[PDB]
Chains A and B, each alone.
Chain A
Amino acid sequence: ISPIETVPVKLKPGMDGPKVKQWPLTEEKIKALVEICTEMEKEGKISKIGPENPYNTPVFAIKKWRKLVDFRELNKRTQDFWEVQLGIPHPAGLKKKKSVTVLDVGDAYFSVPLDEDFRKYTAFTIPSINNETPGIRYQYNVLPQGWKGSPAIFQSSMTKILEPFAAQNPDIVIYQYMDDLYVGSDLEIGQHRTKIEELRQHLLRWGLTTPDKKHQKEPPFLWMGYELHPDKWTVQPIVLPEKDSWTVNDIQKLVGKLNWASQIYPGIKVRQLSKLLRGTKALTEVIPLTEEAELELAENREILKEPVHGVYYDPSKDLIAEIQKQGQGQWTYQIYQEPFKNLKTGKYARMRHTNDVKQLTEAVQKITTESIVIWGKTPKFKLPIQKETWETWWTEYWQATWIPEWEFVNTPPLVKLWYQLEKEPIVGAETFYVDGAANRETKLGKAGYVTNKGRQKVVPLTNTTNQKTELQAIYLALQDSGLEVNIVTDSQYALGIIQAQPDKSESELVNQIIEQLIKKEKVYLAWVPAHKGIGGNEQVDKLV
C-alpha cells in the first residue's frame, strides 16, 4: 500500500453494490485460498469484516495457485472514469536519446490504496467446507485486479508520484504505459545509471517495487509488436502462413499482419486479398485464393524477404512525405527526413468510382492527419502531379479542397487528367440525341440514338437496368460518331457519372466509355428534362 491520497469513487446513480452469491468450491481450493488471504491480509491489502456488510462478489481459483475475483457484476455498477490512453506512441515519433531504461512495477494495482467509503462494495466470501461454518468475510483496501476503476486511478497516482522527481530532474524523459516506465536521457552512462537508481529509490519510498540492474532489460526492445533498437526501429518479424485451404478467419489474420507490416515495409498491397472478404458472413467458410489474390500474396512475400528498418524523429530536420500510385485505387507513401532511411510508410486505398486526382487529394489528407498525431506538424509533400494539372481540377471541382505546400516529382506513373468535356457545344459536329430504357421485371432493354443528320440506331439489350441502358446509349453515340460529337441525354444519372470525369470504375461499361472519351477530340455532353417534349429528345424516347 502507499501514502498516496485516494481518489473518491461513487456507484452509478441510483444503484447499490453487488450482492452476488458464492457457489461452493472444492476442498483443496478452499485451502489454497486462505493461504493467500492470510498473506494478503498481513500485507494490508485485504481485511476481514463483520456481518454488517451485505454485499458479495464471487471468487475462483486457478493455476503455485492464484486467486481470482470476477468483478464483472460490480464493474457494471461503478461510476465511469476518464478513459485511459486509447492509442500508444508510435516509434517513428520518438526522439533519439543516448540511453533508454525500462522499469516495470510489480503488484502495481495492489500498491495503491482504494477510497475508504467505497471499500465495502468489494466484499467477498471464502466458503466453509460442507457449507456449515460461517464464511470468512473480507474486502479490499487497494485497487483490485480487473475492476473498472483500477487502470485510470493507478495511472494518475503514478503521474502524481513522478511529480517531485520530474521537478528535480528536468533533463530526463519518462514515458508512462500501463505498468511500465520508459526513462530516457542524454546523460553520460554513469550519470544515467545513478539517476535510474535514485528514481527507483524514490518510487520505493512511495511503495512501488522496480527491477534492479540485475534485471532491468536491455536493447533491442520487444514492445507492442515492435523491435526498438538503439538507433532504429522495425516491426517484430512477420510470418505469412503457407496453406492450401484458407478459412475466412485465416484471411482476416493475414490481412492484419499485412497491414501491420505496411508501416515500415514499403509497397505491401491488400486490395485483392480483402476483396475476398467483401461478401463475408461465416467465419469458417473456405475461400478460393483467386489468381489475382495469389499474385499479390506472392509479391508481398517478395517484399518481406529482406528486413528493413525505420529511423526515429529529429525535430531539427524537415519532415517530407512522398506519394506513389500503385494502380487499382492503390497508393503508397513514405515519410522521411533522410534519403535512405524512412521514418515510416503506409498505404491508402479508396473504397466506395473516383479519379486519380480526387484520390491523390484523399491520400494527402490521410497523411496530414497522421503526421499531426505523430509529430505535431504537417509534412512538405512531394507529389507526382503537375501544378497545372492540379489547379485545373480543383478550380472546377464542386468541393472545397486544401492543397498544402507541395512540389512536383517527375516519377511515372504521373497523375493527369485523361480527358475533359467541353464547356459549350461544338460547331460542325453531329448532335446525337440518345435515350435508353429497360423493364424492371424482365431485365430486357434497348438503347439508341437519333442524330440531326437523320441517322438512327436502336440496339436490343438483355439483363440490364434503366441505369445501364442510359449509359449504353451514350456508348452507342460515342461509337458511331466522329472525333467531335454533341450528345444530349435525358438522364441525370449518366450525366452525373461522366461530368465527374472518372478514369476508372468497377463496371466494365463505364471503362469502355472512358476509352472512347480519350479517343474523341471534343465531346460536349448536355442535359434536358425527360418526357417534356423538348424536341430532338421527344423523338428518341419514342424509339426506345
Chain B
Amino acid sequence: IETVPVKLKPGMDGPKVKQWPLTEEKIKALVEICTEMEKEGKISKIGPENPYNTPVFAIKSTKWRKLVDFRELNKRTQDFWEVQLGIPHPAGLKKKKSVTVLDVGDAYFSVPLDEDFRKYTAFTIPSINNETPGIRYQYNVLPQGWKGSPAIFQSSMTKILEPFKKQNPDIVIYQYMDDLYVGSDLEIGQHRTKIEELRQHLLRWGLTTPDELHPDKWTVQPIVLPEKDSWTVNDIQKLVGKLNWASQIYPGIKVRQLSKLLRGTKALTEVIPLTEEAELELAENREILKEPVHGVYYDPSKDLIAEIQKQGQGQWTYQIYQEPFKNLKTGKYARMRGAHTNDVKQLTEAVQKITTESIVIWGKTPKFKLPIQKETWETWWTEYWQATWIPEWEFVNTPPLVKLWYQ
C-alpha cells in the first residue's frame, strides 16, 4: 500500500539519544523479540551510515513486551503531525460515568512506513560490558509509541469504527497513541458488555486487542483545616501557618482575629480557648476554601506540570497546574498492597494514574516533577511500567516544607 510521506520540522535533525544499559535478562528478551520482528519484516538491520538512535526497554504479564521511548522523535516530528494530521480531543469524555482503555497498537504493524523516514527510527540492543557494539535496527512499519503512527492510521480507524458508532451514538471513543478510550453512562454491567461488543467488532475487522476509570469524582480536592475539640498554641500556630500559605491561592483569608489569640509569649503546650471573634474567622475561612478558585482556566498552548509529594504509609498527593497556584486538578493516590509495595513501585503507579487522567481531561500528558534521585528512577522505572507511552519528567532537588499542607 502507498506510504504517507513524513517530513521533519525544517532544520530539525533526527534523534540521537543514548541507550541505557540493561540487565542480561532484559537484553535476551529483546534479542528474542527483535529476532521474530525481523522475521516478519517489521524491522531490519542497518549500517553505520545511520547515526540516529532511540532508547529501547523491556517491560511486561509473563510475556516480555518491548517498549520504545520515542519522546525525542515525537518532539521533532509529531509537533507538525499534530497540526498536519492532528486527532481532535473531545471535551465530553471526562463527563461519562465509566471509561475503559483498550489497547489497539497491534493495528499499526500491517501498515508500511515511509521509505525516507525509516532511518529516524533506529534503535540499539545493548551488549553487556561493551563486548559488542550493539545490534542495530530500524522500523519498516509504523511503530508503537510514535505519535505519527495513529495519526497516519486515523482514517482506517475512523472507517472501522463508523458502524459501531452508528449503533451507539452515545458512546465517546478517543484514540491516544496506541489506546482507545471509550466512555459510556451505562451501568457497569451494560458498559462491560458494550465493551465486549466493540472488541468483537474490531476483531472481525482484523484488529486484535489482547484481552475502568470513573471520571465523575475527578475534581480539585478541597483543603482540609484540622477539626479539633480543644486548640493549643502549637495547633493555632500550625493553623495560622497553613492559612497564611492558603492566602496565596484563595485570597480573602483573614487571620488577625486568630493572631491576637496568642498575644503573649506562651508555652508551646498551653491550651487557649478560641474567642467568638476567633471562631468567626475559622468558620468564615473554612467556607471560602470549600468552594473552587476563580480565574483558573486550561490554556491549550501551555504545558501541563504535575507535582507529586510523598506523604507516608502509601499515600501520595499531586497537583496539576500550568502556572503556580492555579491548580487545574489535584488528587491523592493511595496504593493498598499490604507492605508488598515500596516507594518506587508506588511512584510509578502514581505517575501512570496521573498521566491517564491527564489524557482523558485534556488529550495531553504533563511533565512530572518527581521526588526521587534521578539515577534511581533511571534504573527501576521500567520494573513497574505498564503503559505504552512515556511522559516527560525531571527530578525535584529540594523537599517541600509544605508537606501536611496537602493532607
Contacts and interface: CB of A to CB of B under 8 A. Distances in A.
Given A80-B51, A88-B130, A398-B310, A488 B376 contact: no
Contacts of B344: 400-402
B237 interface: yes
A541 B363 CA distance: 51
B133 A376 contact: no
A373 B129 contact: yes
A345 B23 CA distance: 21
Interface in A360-418: 361-362, 365-366, 368-369, 372-377, 394-396, 398-403
A181 B226 CA distance: 72
A488 B49 contact: no
Contacts of A365: 373, 375-376, 379
Nearest to B258: A534
A539 B376 CA distance: 46
B49 A8 contact: yes
Contacts of A402: 342-344, 376, 379-380
B215 interface: no
Contacts, number: 179
Interface stretch (A102-110, A247-255, A523-531): A523-531
Contact of A373 (B21, B132, B260): B21
Interface stretch (A214-222, A426-434, A508-516): A426-434
A223 interface: no
A175 B131 contact: yes
A452 B265 contact: yes
Contacts of B22: 372, 376
A93 B240 contact: no
A529 B241 contact: yes
B160 interface: no
B266 interface: yes
A155 interface: yes
B286 to A, nearest CB: 19
A427 B310 CA distance: 30
B390 to A, nearest CB: 18
Nearest to B244: A529
Contact of B128 (A362, A376, A399, A431): A376
Given A376-B24, A528-B241, A536-B266, A401 B255 contact: no
B98 interface: no
B128 A85 contact: no
B237 A528 contact: yes
B353 interface: no
Interface in B204-235: 233-234
Interface string A475-506: 00000000000101000100110011000000
Interface in B46-71: 47-51, 53
Interface string A244-277: 0000000000000000000000000000000000
Interface string B119-137: 0000000001111110010
Contact of A85 (B133, B244, B265, B398): B133
A527 B403 CA distance: 13
Nearest to A155: B133
B401 A89 contact: no
A239 B49 CA distance: 43
Contacts of A175: 131
A2 interface: no
A44 interface: no
A399 B371 contact: yes
B372 interface: yes
A394 B343 contact: yes
A79 B379 contact: no
B373 A375 contact: no
A152 B48 contact: yes
B244 A532 contact: yes
Contacts of A424: 234
A159 interface: yes
Contact of B255 (A82, A451, A532): A532
A193 interface: no
A117 to B, nearest CB: 13
Contact of A83 (B51, B263, B310, B343): B51
Nearest to B269: A427
Contacts of A369: 21, 375, 379
B307 to A, nearest CB: 13
Contacts of A372: 21-23, 379
Contacts of B31: none
B48 A528 contact: no
Q: Which of A366, A400, A401 has the most CB of B within 10 A?
A: A400
A207 B201 CA distance: 60
Interface string B252-267: 0001000110111111
Given A402-B344, A536-B266, A539-B265, A84 B24 contact: no
B379 A450 contact: no
A386 to B, nearest CB: 19
Pairs of residues from A and B, 10 with the lowest C-beta to C-beta distance, nearest first: A376-B24, A400-B343, A535-B262, A376-B128, A152-B48, A398-B399, A536-B265, A425-B268, A93-B129, A452-B267
29 contacts: A79-B49, A81-B49, A81-B51, A82-B48, A86-B130, A90-B129, A361-B373, A369-B375, A372-B21, A372-B22, A374-B128, A375-B128, A376-B23, A376-B24, A376-B129, A399-B372, A402-B342, A402-B343, A402-B379, A402-B380, A431-B267, A431-B268, A452-B265, A452-B266, A488-B268, A495-B401, A527-B241, A529-B241, A536-B266
